[PDB]
Structure 1
Amino acid sequence: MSEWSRIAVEFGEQQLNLTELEDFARELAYEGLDPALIIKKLKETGGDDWVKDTKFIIVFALTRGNKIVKASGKMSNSGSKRLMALQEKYGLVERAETRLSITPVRVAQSLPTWTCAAAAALKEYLPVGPAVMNLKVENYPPEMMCMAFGSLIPTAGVSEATTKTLMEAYSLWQDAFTKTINVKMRGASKTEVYNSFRDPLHAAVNSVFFPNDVRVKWLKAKGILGPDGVPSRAAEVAAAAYRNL
């Protein structure tokens, strides 16, 4: 023939090796919540005030969302004046055009070990609170009532069965949140709304920046799982409720 197919066919006798091919996929994957760079801008700009600085931004992401410019107009005058100062201080963005972009939801997503705890303390003020969420699943735990907690769910050191059921329970909250927060997904099918958060959620659970030691010791402290390592009663009934309509 020629160099047309002979080179192409000759490429095939090379035998693929699993680890190196996996490494390319491991190195080349979707993630938009890089814990490394997201925290550098907070600490480097503010030496000691960053601890109270991150207090303001994270609760803004947990309560209202990411539309900084749209929220500020509908914000209180006292809140808007300082929020814009924080906006100018770091240069926050509303749309995650790039990974290095600083948006409040990543800050919450990068410090979930408190964000979930803050959600427990702030239940009535959540975007989807007990007034609406409790009408879907009985006695739902308030810790899981958050957006950033998805990075705290374990993936190693605990049985995969607990991970699967806890995946289902969290996914139900996303269904309640996504329908309420977005008008487009209102009235859509159960799978259609589920299609909206496969990638960000699966990236959080498989994230390796958090060691598996901190999550397992934190979960048992809040009672979301029992001493034996299985999720609490409220978790499974939430997971079971997701199976049915």
Structure 2
Amino acid sequence: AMSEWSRIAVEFGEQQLNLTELEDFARELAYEGLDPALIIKKLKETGGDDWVKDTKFIIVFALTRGNKIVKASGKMSNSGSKRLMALQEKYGLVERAETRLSITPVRVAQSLPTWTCAAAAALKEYLPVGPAVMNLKVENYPPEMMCMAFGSLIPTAGVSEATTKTLMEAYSLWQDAFTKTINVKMRGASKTEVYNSFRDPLHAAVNSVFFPNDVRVKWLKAKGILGPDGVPSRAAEVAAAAYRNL
């Protein structure tokens, strides 16, 4: 009212919302941890042959050591150090995901989710936070869930909303545990504060559409995490309950 600027503010408020375009903007700008297609393309293009061989290796590193290439290269066998650093030069691996284009080894593992989670369980005895830590909270925690990549495999279609919620709570057990075990800064945070530090990445993975739900459900059934009826395992239901109970 008072100035032309004041009136402009008021009239801008008088407008009517376009709910279809506001939504688009919202999703356009919504959190996103990675573009799996860009990482797979970068990888396959860069290494022609020897890209499946080279990628897997990057995934075992991510699974067992994280993103910290340089510190890690100094604390490993010579051949593993040698190859790791070779692959870093070769793919331009970075230790921190600054932009959409930055290839961290954990982004690599998150981009091939069903291979990673399978490798996780085969290697459960090498994971930084595996059966030891998990088993003393629940009997038989599904080892495929012991990695950053498992959230991409929780489905949102072909299962009940309750099933999807169970899988997230169960998975949160390991998320919360990994964080505490691994993150120095996070030590002493309430259960909610731990949660928030991973709310967004887990959501973006779940509600992502790159890895198709029908493939998820089948994988889940095949691993026993869902029964044939499409509802969680015993172990999942407990892990979920455990997590709801702190």
1:121-149 deviations in Å (ceiling 9; x for gaps): 11111111212221111221222122211
Tell whether the 8 Å contact from 2:58 to 2:105 is kept in structure 1 after alignment: yes
Which is further off, 10-19 or 219-228?
10-19
Which is further off, 159-168 or 46-55?
46-55
Q: d(CA) in 1 for partners of 2:184 and 2:7?
A: 55
Residue 202 of structure 1: how far off its partner (Å): 1.0
1:186-236 deviations in Å (ceiling 9; x for gaps): 243212222211111111111111121211121111110011111111001
Q: d(CA) in 1 for partners of 2:239 and 2:30?
A: 31
Residue 49 of structure 1: how far off its partner (Å): 1.4
Q: d(CA) in 2 for partners of 1:100 and 1:196?
A: 22
Tell whether the 8 Å contact from 2:130 to 2:143 is kept in structure 1 after alignment: no
* SS of residue in 2 equivalent to 1:74: coil
Residue 13 of structure 1: how far off its partner (Å): 2.9
* SS of residue in 2 equivalent to 1:22: helix
Q: d(CA) in 2 for partners of 1:169 and 1:84?
A: 35
Q: 1:184 to 1:99 in 2, by over 3 A?
A: same
Tell whether the 8 Å contact from 2:217 to 2:226 is kept in structure 1 after alignment: no
Residue 5 of structure 1: how far off its partner (Å): 2.1
Identity over the aligned pairs, expressed in percent?
100
Structure 2 portions without partners, runs of 5+: none
Q: d(CA) in 2 for partners of 1:42 and 1:165?
A: 34
Which is further off, 4-13 or 67-76?
4-13
Q: d(CA) in 1 for partners of 2:217 and 2:74?
A: 41
1:166-192 deviations in Å (ceiling 9; x for gaps): 110000111111111112222432122
Residue 45 of structure 1: how far off its partner (Å): 1.1
Q: d(CA) in 2 for partners of 1:202 and 1:191?
A: 16
Tell whether the 8 Å contact from 2:94 to 2:102 is kept in structure 1 after alignment: yes
* SS of residue in 2 equivalent to 1:191: helix
Tell whether the 8 Å contact from 2:221 to 2:227 is kept in structure 1 after alignment: yes
1:91-147 deviations in Å (ceiling 9; x for gaps): 111011212111100001111111111112111111112122211112212221222
Q: d(CA) in 1 for partners of 2:29 and 2:176?
A: 29
Q: Counterpart in 2 of 1:59? A: 60
Q: d(CA) in 1 for partners of 2:141 and 2:219?
A: 19
Aligned length: 245
Q: d(CA) in 2 for partners of 1:158 and 1:238?
A: 18
* SS of residue in 2 equivalent to 1:5: helix
Q: Counterpart in 1 of 2:86? A: 85
Q: d(CA) in 1 for partners of 2:200 and 2:186?
A: 17
Residue 76 of structure 1: how far off its partner (Å): 0.9
Q: Counterpart in 2 of 1:132? A: 133
Q: d(CA) in 2 for partners of 1:7 and 1:191?
A: 42
Q: d(CA) in 1 for partners of 2:233 and 2:132?
A: 22
Q: d(CA) in 1 for partners of 2:191 and 2:110?
A: 25
* SS of residue in 2 equivalent to 1:156: coil
Q: d(CA) in 2 for partners of 1:195 and 1:23?
A: 25
Residue 152 of structure 1: how far off its partner (Å): 0.8
Runs of 4 or more above 4 Å deviation: none
Residue 6 of structure 1: how far off its partner (Å): 2.1
Residue 2 of structure 1: how far off its partner (Å): 3.8
